[PDB]
Amino acid sequence: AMSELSAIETAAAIAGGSMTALEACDAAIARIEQRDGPINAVVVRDFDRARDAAKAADAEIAAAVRKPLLGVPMTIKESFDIAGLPTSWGFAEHADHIATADSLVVSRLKAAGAVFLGKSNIPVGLADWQSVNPNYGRTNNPHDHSRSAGGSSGGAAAALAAGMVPLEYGSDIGGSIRVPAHFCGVWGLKTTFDAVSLEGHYFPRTDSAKADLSVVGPMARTPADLALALDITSKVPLPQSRIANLSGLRILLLTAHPETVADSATISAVERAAAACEASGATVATSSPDLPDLSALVADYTRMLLVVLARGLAPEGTEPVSLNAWYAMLDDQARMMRAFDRLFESFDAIFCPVLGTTAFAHSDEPDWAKRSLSIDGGIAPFAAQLGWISMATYGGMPALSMPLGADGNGLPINLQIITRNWSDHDAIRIGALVAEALDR
Amino acid sequence: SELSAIETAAAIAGGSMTALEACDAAIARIEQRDGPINAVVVRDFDRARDAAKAADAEIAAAVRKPLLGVPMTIKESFDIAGLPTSWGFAEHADHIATADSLVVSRLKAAGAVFLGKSNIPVGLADWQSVNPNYGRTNNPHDHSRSAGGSSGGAAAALAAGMVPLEYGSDIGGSIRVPAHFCGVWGLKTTFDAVSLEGHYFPRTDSAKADLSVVGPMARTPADLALALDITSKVPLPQSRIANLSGLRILLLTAHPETVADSATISAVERAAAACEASGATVATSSPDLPDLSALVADYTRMLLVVLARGLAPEGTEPVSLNAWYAMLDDQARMMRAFDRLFESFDAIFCPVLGTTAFAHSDEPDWAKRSLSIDGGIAPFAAQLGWISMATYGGMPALSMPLGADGNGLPINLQIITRNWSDHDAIRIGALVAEALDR
């Protein structure tokens, strides 16, 4: 009913003359000041300098200059660097750390003409499926202010779902792009590993970006905005999709995991997307002899994630992992990556839940081991849900989180579409085709 | 002169010759010329003739592939199902691979026929090609000098005209140095742009995840570009450079930690001068050129760790995983320093190595080795600085024929371009050849 312009639609209106870049900037500033009160998503604001960049974009528009995102207002996850703006990752010690240079993703998007109004909220250390920190506060889900907006790119997904900005960009090392888009019912693409540069996504007061597991990708409300943002930010132009329809598509449907569980409403929602593809000409399978050991994957992924997040350091007394043992873990990862290369020889995509349930209620327990989730009235471990996102992060494959529907309480349910490595554009295309199939 | 890889595929698809005829003609050139050279040390001629007969059947079905029926060889470190992969070790001579490597799969899918594999040093750890399993490869321009390493057999087979295409690996110049010694074309690719799946250490599934790259080797720049398009993880950005006019070239004939021949210095200077006459701008210094003396030191400390798999001699303390993560951040800092350098320059022109092909050496320790630079003795291991920038920075580096020294040994030029501009390095190289032939 209530609808906002997409990133491509905004650029088309500015290039045509329906509106100016300053009008689009001021319209988004209005939506932020009007709607971010109960949501607390756009926690870093640079509206004055954003209006100056929109006035410069209209000068280029008047100089007949045309760029794919010229004048389009947007925000980015607070973990990305913007010159003049702070980068804190939620740490109070790092709230006065002001970046001196823009991040690569910001440079790429600015070079396409985008205007950055500010940065979206995050949890402390980007280490939660929530968005809460002592510098900015807590971000609330626009669909139910009592539930989490997700994390670590929760402020990004909440700003999108509330219609404040049409485009965003987040990071993902343990679902931190797919889970926020799942909780807020927006579009988020976990990209292929090493496909987009993490330069500028630095830990505060360093130049260190994660060299393992972590990926940065676009977040939006339309698959076309995701595809344009991917082409603007990738290290090289990635292969465009040649999938024209769902006929002939090979889909592996997974509604269960050896180490975690999913809602009945979640299972029926993912099963409904697969059925919409079968009626559109696709073939869907529920088992494969080439599906890797997901129980070993999640175990090997968790052991690597904790080492990457700890920078190889160990608790006092505990012996650290050796460099030789780390090299052995990378060979274990590459062994799993090829196991998925063989799986993706018989299947075009994996359809599975993003997470086992919808957005959970706000939690003040920092320890994931002291948390639990309600799966159809039952008590389930919280951290075990990392298995739903382990395949794409540990295998490196692109994974799309796209809106599928909502549960009985109105909380969005998203679908995870996993395709083979470097087929990010196929994950976007299959997702757009799933949306068409579900709207018929 | 021999046919190139593209010319061979064009003659097979046109009907000038068949794929079995091209296979048998390359088998003939190998058996006729590899006697004093010893480059094609693993031979699969029987199964190669069966694959050429299958290519001719596809050719007769109007099927057309870019390398359909083209006979070639690959460096012995690459896996081919049914063929051994030993890396020169006697302990690994009976290690037969069960599946083809990724590069071999890509090239076979483009229609290439693999006649065999080219010689290597033990452990791929020398600028020579000699091992107890196959013997020594000799430079086709002077059988007393090294053919290069670690992909020396590949460059020697190309220089002798046996096969039109080859593929090697490079962690310390092992693609550029062999092509430099034999006067052929070799592309050190951008890091992580081509998969090393199948380039496994014998009897493992472990491929180097740092510094090392695999790239094409040929005698024409156009053959390099086709093989790159066939083997890269994704189609890489094609070059839009049409001529040398307007090109920004940083000419480097000196290094803070090593030296170059006077004939080498004049050869690289002659390539740079040919570009100025074609409209290019050439500079001899840049305030944005990183500290090459620190680069080689940080690269050498990382190279030794990668080659040792993090292990340390007894008594010596190993490098910690935390310290390793810091070394990767030190590497990325240097990579961004080159991103700024390549904002003012399109390419770096510098020597591949400080001198031409050296005489066969039996000293395993590089610290006990030396090189003859214009009558003087210069350290051997210090020459790693000529190849350190591209490997440690990740940039693509092309080794292309420039000429020969006074003794007839080839001198090649190293063309370094920015990361992911592999096709620009090939294009600038092809344009350097045109300018020097005028």
Author numbering:
A (entry chain A): 15 to 454
B (entry chain B): 17 to 454
Paste lines from the article.
Here, the ligand‐free crystal structure of UMG‐SP2, a metagenome‐derived urethanase with depolymerization activities, at 2.59 Å resolution, as well as its (co‐)structures bound to a suicide hydrolase inhibitor and a short‐chain carbamate substrate at 2.16 and 2.40 Å resolutions, respectively, is reported. UMG‐SP2 belongs to the amidase signature protein superfamily (AS family), which is characterized by a highly conserved GGSS(S/G)GS motif and can be found in bacteria, archaea, and eukaryotes. SP2 shares the domain architecture of amidases, with an α/β‐fold containing 12 prominent α‐helices, 12 β‐strands, and five larger loops. Structural analysis and molecular dynamics simulations reveal that the flexible loop L3 consisting of residues 219–226 is crucial for regulating the hydrolytic activity of UMG‐SP2.
The crystal structures of wild‐type (WT) UMG‐SP2 (GenBank Accession No. OP972510) were solved in a substrate‐free state (SP2, also used as an interchangeable designation for WT UMG‐SP2 for simplification, 2.59 Å resolution) and a complex with the phenylmethylsulfonyl moiety of the suicide inhibitor PMSF covalently bound to the active site serine 190 (SP2PMS, 2.16 Å resolution). The structures of SP2S190A and SP2 were solved by MR based on the refined structure of SP2PMS omitting the covalently modified S190. Due to the hydrophobic nature of the entire active site cavity, two glycerol molecules from the cryoprotectant solution were found bound to the active site in the substrate‐free structure, one of which contacted the backbone of the oxyanion hole residues (left inset). In the ligand‐free structure, A141 is in the vicinity of a glycerol molecule. In SP2 and SP2PMS, K224 (part of L3 at the perimeter of the secondary active site cavity) interacts with several water molecules and H215 (as well as S222 in the SP2 structure). These interactions consolidate K224 pointing toward the substrate binding cavity and blocking the secondary active site sterically (right insets). The surface of SP2 is largely negatively charged, but positive charge overweighs the substrate‐free structure in the primary and secondary active site cavities, in contrast to the BBC‐bound SP2S190A. This charge difference is also the result of the aforementioned structural switch that distinguishes SP2 from the substrate‐bound complex structure of SP2S190A. Due to the steric blockage of the active site when empty or partially occupied by PMS, substrate accessibility (in particular for larger molecules) is limited, in contrast to the complex structures with one or two BBC molecules bound.
